[PDB]
Ligand code: SF4
């Protein structure tokens with residue numbers, strides 16, 4: 001086998017055409033000698049340029065450079081030969097692997113279906129690498145990764161003195177597979193003798209009484225986090241633990257997972273929220289490719305640089321573009337925030353089931369804006385949303401008016417016979433066929449390619465995108481999405497953000513997006529509803545307020561302050577106990593866009 005790209009980098013800060021004659025390059029260059037364009041002259045910025053499309057990689061120019069402003073490398077037997085696994089010809093292929101490490105938290109960021117999960121099975125002893133050949137042994141794996149830390153992994157893995165435990169990419173499998181209580185389960189799975197510490201730090205002592213099927217999202221997720229650590233294993237691989245956790249939970253779970261590094265145990269993590277990712281990890285991997293054709297894991301990076309580079313879409317270590325535009329964000333000074341017309345107003349409501357109490361203070365709904373809902377789970381974010389939605393009748397007050405409400409529920413389960421196209425089509429055929437919904441909603445969330453399978457025959461992340469798109473293609477005055485964040489990746493999360501923002505702004509309509517992922521809030525929100533009280537008991541919904549004034553108000557009850565990163569612009573979470581943490585909290589401004 002073979003395969004090879006040439007990559008040329010010239011440290012211009014070291015080049016000086018006038019000192020080496022006249023671009024010693026083009027002169028000494030064999031290809032240019034025979035009438036070729038390996039090295040071209042930028043007779044303006046006065047620099048030399050190597051057109052890697054030519055350069056034989058002979059390296060003559062490199063040896064000649066009177067300084068050493070030239071490097072030419074052949075990505076041979078390293079990027080093409082590395083090839084790890086092929087599922088048979090005309091089928092998915094993996095290149096490279098994430099490099100897990102002891103005593104450290106190895107991060108992963110990169111869109112779904114790029115064989116994140118392919119690598120897990122590989123590492124779990126349950127799939128032998130063929131190295132895109134025909135192999136069915138460990139030994140060729142151990143050799144191929146010679147010069148690297150993963151050889152040592154495959155040697156232990158085969159002796160079988162390590163076995164990694166894996167928190168699966170979809171959960172909601174344990175309730176329909178394991179019956180009885182969270183109390184029970186957590187005794188059973190116990191083998192680590194750390195039962196006390198776990199259940200307490202992740203605050204599942206109230207959550208023991210309920211049965212698995214009676215859990216809400218945040219709780220079910222965390223109970224999996226618990227049961228994975230109580231199984232005995234050195235290596236713990238968490239695939240998407242950000243699903244359905246609220247803002248308060250996800251920051252607290254991050255601390256729990258981070259404390260593992262100190263115990264010297266190896267954590268491998270997928271996260272799709274940059275603030276949570278920054279905080280946990282110590283290494284970071286970027287994974288690039290178009291889903292379902294190939295995936296390649298990049299070289300290990302230090303968390304901060306790795307994230308910067310993801311945002312830029314350009315790899316300077318690997319020389320790969322993988323997205324033709326940059327990840328970007330919206331402050332509050334990059335907008336027009338001007339007042340708009342009142343759609344409706346709601347008085348004081350108060351709903352008591354008699355197993356939770358909510359009071360909603362008097363509030364205004366404006367037209368043409370996007371209101372983010374924030375707070376910890378079971379604080380009746382959902383109780384409010386459901387009162388306008390019509391599935392719950394307020395005990396007192398009125399919200400149920402002649403606005404039509406479009407409602408995306410918290411769980412997703414399908415009950416629909418027929419295709420993705422049937423399901424959408426009966427709502428508004430018309431919308432499907434117009435160019436806007438095609439630029440902003442349907443096309444970048446993959447739905448054009450999804451019309452051929454049934455709704456029941458769609459998987460969690462595709463089906464999520466399908467629910468979301470469905471709710472926004474309903475004909476309504478006001479759009480209600482309860483927690484769409486679940487099972488979306490970074491790119492998806494962002495695409496849904498740009499779609500919500502454009503569609504709502506253009507037709508001047510209201511939407512409520514209950515939200516907990518920092519980035520979506522950071523882009524989309526015009527106004528905020530902060531929830532407080534003590535969850536599972538009482539909640540007090542405070543009236544709508546400005547985006548900044550809201551995230552300020554709320555962040556102060558979490559102890560956790562947010563900056564603006566200076567490298568390429570993203571929400572920077574600041575470590576509890578830091579300079580910035582201390583300066584923000586002292587000065588009553590607990591947040592910056
Ligand atoms: S070799 Fe490339 S870098 Fe060294 S001087 Fe000539 S042009 Fe500038």
Ligand code: SF4
Nearest residue numbers: 055056057058059072
């Ligand atoms: S061989 Fe080395 S120098 Fe000659 S072209 Fe290819 S890269 Fe540039």
